[PDB]
Amino acid sequence: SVFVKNVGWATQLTSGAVWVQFNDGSQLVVQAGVSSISYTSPNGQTTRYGENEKLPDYIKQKLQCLSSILLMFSNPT
Amino acid sequence: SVFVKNVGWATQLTSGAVWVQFNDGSQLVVQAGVSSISYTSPNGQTTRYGENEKLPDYIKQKLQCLSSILLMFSNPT
């Protein structure tokens, strides 16, 4: 019935937003925020962080790799 | 210094989770929840929804198109 035509997002450090445009012309803008962060070390100890907890520097630099901006367009003919 | 090797996510209607694995073996699991939803109709009237607010059926069916599960692997040699 209804499907996606164009998408795009911009994710910051502690939140993100997704923009979507459908075939019928409607648009959906979804704002999302981080509720919890889980980090398992390479040797196997797990550590969960909360919505308000402070993040260490070596965790922040790894979270920076997730921050990105995407754009995709349906390009017929 | 540190970059991403494998990613994956599973998005529900009002939230989502992203799984990421780095080259050094570390893993990041990010839980996110929707804070606000903006819907502009094809003719142009906007409507904003809240973090907890209920959604009409024609909004839920369009949000269902966003729900997806992705998985990506780095495949050297």
Author numbering:
A (entry chain A), B (entry chain B): 890 to 966
Question: Would you copy out the relevant sentences from the publication that reported this structure?
Answer:
PLK4, and this interaction targets STIL to centrioles. allows homo-multimerisation, the interaction with the PB3 domain of PLK4, or both. structures and interactions of CCDs and PLK4-PB3s in humans and flies. STIL/Ana2, which can then interact with and recruit Sas-6.
structure of the strand swapped dimers is unambiguous. similar to that seen in the mouse PB3 crystal (MmPB3, grey cartoon). mouse PB3 domain behaving as an unusual strand-swapped dimer. crystal structures of the human (this study) and mouse PB3. monomer, with the multimeric forms dominating.
